[PDB]
Structure formats: C-alpha cells, structure tokens
Amino acid sequence: GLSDGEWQQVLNVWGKVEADIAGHGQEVLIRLFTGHPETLEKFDKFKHLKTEAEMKASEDLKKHGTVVLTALGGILKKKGHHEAELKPLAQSHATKHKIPIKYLEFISDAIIHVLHSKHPGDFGADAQGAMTKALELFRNDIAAKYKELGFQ
C-alpha cells in the first residue's frame, strides 16, 4: 500500500522513463542479464547474446525492453488497482515462462540501479523509497498468484 504522495513520486519518476522508454528498457534488461546471467537462460530469443556489446546492439532486446516497461507502466499507472493487468502476467510468467519470483526481485533492483545511473542526483531518497515500495507491491501481488498456482 502506497500513499497518494508516494504514488505521485512514482508517477513523477515514471515520467523520466517515458521520455525514453526504449533506452530505459534496454538498460534494465542488460543490468539484469549481466548482473544475473542465469536469467538470460529463460529467454530463447536472447540466450545467444554472449557479450554485453551484443546486448547493447540488439534492436530486438530494445524492442522487448519497450514491451516490458510499457506493461510495467500500465500497471504503475493503476496505482495499485492492477488486478486485471497483473493476473495475465503472473499466469504467463508462472506457467509458460517459468520465472521464479527471485528474478522479479532481481529486475526490481535493476530498475532502481538504472534510474540512479541515468539520473544521478535526480533520483532522490523519497523517490527511491516510493519506487521501491511500488515494485515490492507489484512483486508481492505476483507472489500471491504464484502461490495459488503452486509455482516455485
């Protein structure tokens, strides 16, 4: 649960992401893949990427980064009222993609990392606190659907 002030910060920070959704999406995925190589194995269409240079050069990775952050932004803009939006994502990630919740923790931290990297000094303490809570909420609601499905 976030306060309205906190949601306001989240959506303020998100305005930064939306000015360049593909650049942000790209850097998030790269941070995930390089920080946690086992995650790369879950993508049949990225598993070929051996080096970070190849990742940076991949237009399809940038494309998918856009898809991911477009979906996350859709969800964030609901300010917690995201059941309809989140349920299909939980179900596809549990049943088709088979993504353990640990990896959603990974990408959550990666988003925080990227925001500091692209906006040093422009991502204050309050903003980090709000974004972190929002990603925890997102993660926690997915976690509930995972439990329901018996997925580890």
Angle at the Cα of 102 from the Cα atoms of 97 and 108, rounded to 5 degrees: 95
Cβ of residue 121: shortest distance to ligand HEM, in angstroms? 25
Cβ of residue 41: shortest distance to ligand HEM, in angstroms? 9
- Judged by CB under 6 A, the number of residues near ligand HEM is 17
Token pair recorded at residue 60: 């399809």
Q: Rounded to the nearest 10 degrees, how much is the dihedral formed by the CA atoms of 57, 122, 107, 12?
A: -110
Does 26 bind ligand HEM (CB under 6 A)? Our answer is no
Residues 1-20 that bind ligand HEM (CB under 6 A): none
Piece of 5-13, 55-63, 103-111, 143-151 that binds ligand HEM (CB under 6 A) = 103-111
C-beta neighbour count of 90 within 10 angstroms: 21
Among 68, 114, 134, 137, binds ligand HEM (CB under 6 A): 68
Does 45 bind ligand HEM (CB under 6 A)? Our answer is yes
Task: Give the CA count within 13 Å in the CB-facing half-sphere of 146.
Answer: 18
Does 104 bind ligand HEM (CB under 6 A)? Our answer is yes
Find out whether 135 and 111 touch, Cβ atoms under 8 Å.
yes
Task: For residues 109 and 53, give the distance between their C-alpha atoms in angstroms, rounded to a whole number.
Answer: 22
Query: Which positions touch ligand HEM (CB under 6 A)?
Result: 39, 42-45, 67-68, 71-72, 89, 92-93, 97, 99, 103-104, 107
* Binding region for nitrite: 64
